[PDB]
Design an enzyme around this catalytic site. Structure first.
Site, PDB file in Angstrom:
ATOM      1  N   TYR A  27       0.787  -1.069   0.110  1.00 34.49           N
ATOM      2  CA  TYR A  27       0.030  -0.027   0.120  1.00 34.49           C
ATOM      3  C   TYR A  27       0.864   1.285   0.038  1.00 34.49           C
ATOM      4  CZ  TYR A  27      -4.218  -2.920   0.425  1.00 34.49           C
ATOM      5  OH  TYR A  27      -5.037  -3.874   0.083  1.00 34.49           O
ATOM      6  N   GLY A  29       3.138   4.095  -1.382  1.00 36.25           N
ATOM      7  CA  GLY A  29       3.546   4.672  -2.730  1.00 36.25           C
ATOM      8  C   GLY A  29       2.829   4.320  -4.033  1.00 36.25           C
ATOM      9  N   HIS A  47      -3.833   5.383   5.059  1.00 28.52           N
ATOM     10  CA  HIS A  47      -3.589   6.716   4.305  1.00 28.52           C
ATOM     11  C   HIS A  47      -4.108   6.775   2.939  1.00 28.52           C
ATOM     12  CE1 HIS A  47      -1.116   9.668   1.857  1.00 28.52           C
ATOM     13  NE2 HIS A  47      -1.172  10.569   2.805  1.00 28.52           N
ATOM     14  N   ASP A  48      -4.306   5.775   2.284  1.00 27.99           N
ATOM     15  CA  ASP A  48      -4.876   5.441   1.126  1.00 27.99           C
ATOM     16  C   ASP A  48      -6.485   5.715   1.267  1.00 27.99           C
ATOM     17  OD1 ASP A  48      -2.527   5.142  -0.060  1.00 27.99           O
ATOM     18  OD2 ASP A  48      -2.873   2.716  -0.174  1.00 27.99           O
TER      19      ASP A  48
END
Ligand SMILES: CN1[C@@H]2CC[C@H]1C[C@H](OC(=O)[C@H](CO)c1ccccc1)C2
Length: 121
Positions: A27, A29, A47-48
């Site tokens: 997950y 970058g 964060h995504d």
């Protein structure tokens, strides 16, 4: 913005966002699929999702302002998108810092085929 997030990551952890967090696990970058590999990867998953809460915002390019109150990050008032993006980035930077104790280099440049399956936000 992505560049600002990278500076925040370096400030918080002492690690360069590229390459320490730009291609880490499933997950970090590049997002997508799979079971996050460890706590650091879970920071990126969340964060995504956080960016995913903001459909009509542009996290990669939109710049926000923040300051330090002693070590604490304080997001300063901008547009609503900027405020929300800043809070997402702040949380991820803190999360990376909290999980440096288990950061593992083996997850850098992690191959896509080892990341399968949906994990709901
Ligand atoms: C703000 N944009 C979203 C769609 C592309 C980006 C980044 C998103 O999720 C990410 O933060 C990941 C890193 O964890 C990412 C993937 C690919 C490019 C940039 C960032 C949501």
């Amino acid at each position: 913005s992505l560049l600002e997030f990278g500076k925040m990551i370096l400030e918080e952890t002492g690690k360069l966002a590229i390459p320490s967090y730009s291609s880490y696990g499933c997950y970090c970058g590049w997002g997508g699929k799979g079971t996050p590999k460890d706590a650091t990867d879970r920071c990126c998953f969340v964060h995504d999702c956080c960016y995913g809460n903001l459909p009509d915002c542009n996290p990669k390019s939109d710049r926000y302002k923040y300051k330090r109150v002693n070590g604490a990050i304080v997001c300063e008032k901008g547009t609503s998108c900027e405020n929300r993006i800043c809070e997402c980035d702040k949380a991820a930077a803190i999360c990376f810092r909290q999980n440096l104790n288990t950061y593992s280099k083996k997850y850098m440049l992690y191959p896509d085929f080892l990341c399968k399956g949906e994990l709901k936000c």
